[PDB]
Design a protein around this ligand. Sequence first.
Ligand SMILES: Nc1nc2c(c(=O)[nH]1)N[C@@H](CNc1ccc(C(=O)N[C@@H](CCC(=O)N[C@@H](CCC(=O)N[C@@H](CCC(=O)O)C(=O)O)C(=O)O)C(=O)O)cc1)CN2
Ligand SMILES: N[C@@H](CCS)C(=O)O
Ligand SMILES: [Zn+2]
Length: 766
Amino acid sequence: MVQSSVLGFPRIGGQRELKKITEAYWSGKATVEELLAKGKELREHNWKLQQKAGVDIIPSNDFSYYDQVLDLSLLFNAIPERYTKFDLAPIDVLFAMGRGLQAAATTQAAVDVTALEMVKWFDSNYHYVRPTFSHSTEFKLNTAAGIKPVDEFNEAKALGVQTRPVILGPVSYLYLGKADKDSLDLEPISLLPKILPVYKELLQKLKEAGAEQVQIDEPVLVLDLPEAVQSKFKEAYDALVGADVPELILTTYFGDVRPNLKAIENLPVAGFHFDFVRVPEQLDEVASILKDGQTLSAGVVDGRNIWKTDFAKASAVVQKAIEKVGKDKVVVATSSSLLHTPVDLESETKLDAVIKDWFSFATQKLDEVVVIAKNVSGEDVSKQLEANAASIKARSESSITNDPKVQERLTTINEALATRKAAFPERLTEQKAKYNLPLFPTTTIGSFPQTKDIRINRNKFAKGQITAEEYEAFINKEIETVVRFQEEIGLDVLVHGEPERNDMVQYFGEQLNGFAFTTNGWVQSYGSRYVRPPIIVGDVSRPKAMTVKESVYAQSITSKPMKGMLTGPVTILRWSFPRDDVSGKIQALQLGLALRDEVNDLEGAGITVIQVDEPAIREGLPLRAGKERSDYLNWAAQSFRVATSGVENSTQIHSHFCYSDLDPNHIKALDADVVSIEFSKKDDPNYIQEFSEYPNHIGLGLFDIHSPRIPSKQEFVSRIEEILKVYPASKFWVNPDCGLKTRGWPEVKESLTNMVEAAKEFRAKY
Ligand SMILES: Nc1nc2c(c(=O)[nH]1)N[C@@H](CNc1ccc(C(=O)N[C@@H](CCC(=O)N[C@@H](CCC(=O)N[C@@H](CCC(=O)O)C(=O)O)C(=O)O)C(=O)O)cc1)CN2
Ligand SMILES: N[C@@H](CCS)C(=O)O
Ligand SMILES: [Zn+2]
């Protein structure tokens, strides 16, 4: 009777309960008791949900108030000193690392401190708070905050639910972290010896509590790892394994671990886990490594995409496994945590029933693994296979999916379609001459605060409580407000705030043929911010203009130059749920050609300064050097270039990138005139050097837009002075790290006023 396993479940709630309480707590409208109360409530719900679904192995510690990595950075006490000298409570220290904190002296005692870096969790649009280590860091097992994975195991057990804690392992933990600036000579992985005795302690604490088996994520194995890292796995797991700890199920996902087999082919663990959705072909080789005892969790229900599973194909993999290692040592599992999927599809009432029948969100995926497991167990689930098999046939055969007019148009793509009419140095002279822009020119990145008044009115529109005529009126008020202000403040190149845009990708899925999109289809991106990425189901085209009506009005009320704003083709792909049938290369290209038509429409409609965001360009990079990556590099830029290479030289193409380990050389391939690079929040020591040679114009981001912190005019100056030491002023632009949707108005005002005030000084010194 083959068992089922889930690697992690989405904590946000079916009604984003979690967001709502977290944001309340942050704004002083809910007590700390009330936040923790609701945490419990959700934890309880989701465990019970899975229990009822029939899942055998059920995760614990997958819950988090912000990020499960940081959660460990807390537990193990990797807490930069600067966060400690304010008598904050564990929970608030946690949040402060997250989003900084700043309150003047109230009883309440005065704090001001930044936030730690945030980066892509592998090739996903989930972002973790990056561990930050230092020579001073004393790894102890913190008990002040409680001990989370213990306490949550116990909770579950007190509802009769036996769970499998999930912990990021020492090697991944370190390798993914970073040295703090007070300690540049520090490889994070060198602390392995200091940290194990902590992981060890935790583990015994868990064993005593009742923990049979523990999932311990070591996903770094899907990456290119130098030889000196690979040898540290044995050291690590040799240390931890024992009679006083639970059995450990070394867990990998998102890619291929074969290059690292030597690393792990003689470890003491109780079993492994692998992603046979992304890399089914690795099964024979990895299964080879299993010395008796050990179990193989067979990751076969996609924790990263929402296409309904093919029960035939999936069960065939699990049986290939069963052939190699015995039915009794095999487990049907999600390929990854379902963190990256929405909660429940049944919450969606406005999708074509045909299309809906093609999908499965988290709740459904629980049934999925339950059924496949049952299948291979010899049990009758005939009725579910056929229905499932129907769902597949249908998908397979659809008039929706294909659009010949597109497929042809693809063969119009060549070098010329993706080269501008002249080189940057020649376009600058034309642009300088049109725009008359001043030295140290100031601008922002697009979005301005997404005020509940905007959210409520988009919604009243969606739901017919107001006419289109009324919505246009409302949007214009708000673009007017957003301009009038930008003018007030002194900004040079303007934007329009994106008031009319739910999300920089969803606004587009709602407008392009080939898509679907959700109402309650939300996934966490970081902290309390979530998105409901759209879904690509067919061949992509743009039948109308998407953003002209708005930007033309925008341009019409200001003499100032104004940006249009799209989302480049790679980002639309990467932050959508991609197609099952086809490659992403084919999808980007379609998007490129499709986005051209908007870009062109803009130029034609008067909007001669245009920004096309491409922030996922690094995210979307394949997890391993070789054929697939070097292809990615080439088509990924090409598609971008496709949507931008028809413009006149007098037109100013802008881009933007953020919250990623950016590769300048690839960014450069886009030959954009001007870009915005997230720099402040990420405290990257090298970004300055590594972008020493960037040939086109550039604005490294001057303040962290994900903290309510207002930076001094002084903190702007410092950063600038710092950059100017490696870069000439005739290139440098001044802007924030990213957009301002999440920000409130008070701090928007004051922080830009400072930014600009500061730019204005360097203006006059030169
Ligand atoms: N997709 C994406 N990825 C990205 C970024 C980005 O902007 N987008 N930037 C970086 C960071 N990621 C981010 C992710 C989300 C948000 C964000 O601001 N999300 C908002 C809302 C976004 C949205 O979809 N807004 C809708 C939702 C409105 C709403 O909630 N309405 C209510 C009903 C009306 C009401 O009561 O308010 C409801 O549905 O229940 C809208 O404006 O229309 C949030 O969940 O806090 C920001 C950055 C990197 N990756
Ligand atoms: N233009 C987007 C960029 C987010 S990465 C915004 O300003 O919200
Ligand atoms: Zn950004």
